[PDB]
């Protein structure tokens, strides 16, 4: 009565992350079918993340007042049905695809908010962590499976349409099994404190920078590689390679960071922000070489992106430790939620659209040729290393005030207790 619940919720989260990136792996086709440009090409992901951002806290609230199995089943059926129906739109409408992405966002946010509470409450203190970790290992695997599934099905059938109709039916299955196996189970005063905690603010802004980089690159890079292979007169394995890389890199970073922490925690007490800052600057150094390696040899570009992906995801498992190191316990429920909201408001909400806008504004004042389309996208994407470097300085800035923050925190907890 527990293992079945764990397995079914895990597969649910894998489907959740598999049905976000099926747009990207077929992006090149949509732009031609509907007669839109890049400025409209980024709007899909921008609207998706905006809907998710506005949705998640409301279902977080309602999850404590009505039953939760019902909400999970309703949400999974909702986004399955909407994503199945969206694939039948004709060539003269685009706002319908935009609205489709919004609704899929609502459903996905529902599931992602309410699953962890159940998978945590059905276990005790000592074993909660292992199954929570197994639950969270669904992120990179589904992320890669997105590109792989989209490219494989689109190539196999011969039309991009069925790229959005193979996934939902599998969801249609799960929507019933959760109704079979899993058993039923003053914030304002906090704000005036959290914005006076320097490490908290700087860590939040740094995570925002990381989110900007991740969203922009993850949406756009495959199209850039396609344009590169075209201009060099060498040319869709492109979407597959990338996927594979992700499915590995997310693990390595999450290991290496952790390891490098347990050493530096024994030589000083500023370990975590220093490790994160060093890794981030290294990531910037290697990322800024893709845009020069792609014009000579493609394998060099792939090696560069591999090292960048490894070093960029290192700080995934450290920011939580900082947050619980510098905040009193009875605020953590607040201090977490806010951060996630902010992490989306300055990050993936407006990144792909901004990249597309810059690219189109560059191209409108030059001749229309494959070469200049290449140069437009390549010059536009140069902002990612800039923001990575800025985030690195933000981690140094929090490494300065770390100790004083901890001292204040201990004084507060003892005074209250």
């Amino acid at each position, epitope marked *: 009565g527990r293992g079945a619940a764990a397995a079914i919720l895990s597969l649910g989260n894998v489907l959740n992350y598999l049905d976000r990136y099926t747009v990207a792996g077929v992006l090149l086709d949509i732009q031609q079918h509907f007669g839109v440009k890049d400025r409209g090409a980024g709007l899909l992901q921008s609207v998706f993340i905006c809907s998710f951002m506005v949705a998640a806290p409301i279902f977080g609230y309602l999850g404590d007042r009505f039953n939760r199995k019902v909400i999970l089943s309703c949400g999974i059926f909702f986004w399955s049905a909407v994503t199945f129906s969206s694939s039948f739109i004709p060539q003269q409408y685009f706002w319908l695809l935009v609205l489709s992405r919004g609704l899929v966002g609502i459903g996905e946010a529902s599931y992602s908010t309410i699953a962890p509470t159940i998978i945590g409450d059905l276990f005790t203190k000592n074993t909660r962590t292992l199954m929570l970790s197994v639950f969270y290992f669904a992120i990179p695997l589904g992320s890669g499976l997105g590109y792989i599934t989209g490219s494989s099905v689109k190539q196999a059938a011969g039309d991009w349409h069925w790229a959005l109709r193979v996934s939902p039916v599998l969801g249609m299955i799960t929507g019933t099994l959760i109704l079979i196996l899993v058993p039923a189970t003053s914030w304002l005063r906090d704000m005036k404190a959290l914005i006076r905690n320097r490490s908290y603010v700087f860590s939040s802004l740094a995570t925002s920078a990381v989110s900007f980089a991740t969203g922009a690159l993850g949406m756009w890079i495959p199209l850039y590689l396609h344009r590169a292979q075209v201009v060099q007169k060498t040319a869709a394995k492109d979407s597959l390679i990338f996927g594979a890389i992700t499915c590995f890199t997310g693990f390595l970073g999450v290991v290496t960071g952790a390891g490098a922490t347990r050493w530096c925690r024994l030589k000083t007490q500023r370990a975590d922000p220093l490790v994160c800052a060093v890794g981030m600057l290294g990531s910037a150094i290697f990322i800024c070489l893709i845009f020069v390696a792609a014009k000579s040899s493609i394998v060099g570009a792939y090696i560069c992106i591999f090292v960048g992906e490894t070093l960029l995801f290192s700080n995934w498992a450290i920011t939580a430790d900082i947050l619980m190191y510098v905040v009193i316990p009875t605020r953590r429920a607040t201090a977490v939620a806010l951060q996630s909201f902010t992490s989306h408001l300055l990050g993936d909400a407006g990144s792909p659209y901004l990249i597309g806008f810059i690219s189109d504004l560059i191209r409108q004042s030059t001749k229309d040729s494959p070469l200049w389309e290449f140069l437009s996208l390549g010059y536009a994407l140069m902002l990612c290393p800039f923001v990575v470097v800025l985030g690195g300085m933000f981690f140094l800035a929090t490494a300065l005030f770390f100790v004083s923050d901890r001292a204040r925190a201990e*004084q507060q907890v003892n005074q209250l207790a």
Partner: nanobody, 126 residues
């Protein structure tokens, strides 16, 4: 790991001092210090904990006014001093290291500590 030293047999009304040290060049100034005890027929209860920066200490209720815990990270040591022992204190003492904050009602959580020692015994005769 850590190394604990001291321990032995005392008469009622005496005093005894134990030490807990980090071998080698390791520092343990992040957060690493608390003392626990276990007896031959009861579960493991916490005795005391001391914090990182400000020298804030917290004790258990049955041992207030009799124990003192002190830290010294110039030589990488922590010390425990006991006065006015009774036949009830015969037990084995442990040194432990974790991340949570020194506060009341956090002594008894011995499932989140990162580093454990091996412990030394104290016996009180009559």
């Amino acid at each position: 790991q850590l190394v604990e030293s001291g321990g032995g047999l005392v008469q009622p009304g005496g005093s005894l001092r134990l030490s807990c040290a980090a071998p080698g060049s390791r520092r343990f100034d992040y957060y690493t210090l608390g003392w626990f005890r276990q007896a031959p027929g009861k579960e493991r209860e916490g005795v005391s904990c001391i914090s990182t920066v400000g020298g804030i200490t917290n004790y258990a209720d049955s041992v207030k006014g009799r124990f003192i815990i002190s830290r010294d990270n110039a030589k990488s040591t922590v010390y425990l001093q006991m006065n006015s022992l009774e036949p009830e204190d015969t037990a084995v003492y442990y040194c432990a290291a974790g991340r949570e904050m020194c506060a009341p009602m956090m002594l008894g959580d011995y499932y989140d500590m990162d580093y454990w020692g091996k412990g030394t015994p104290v016996t009180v005769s009559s």
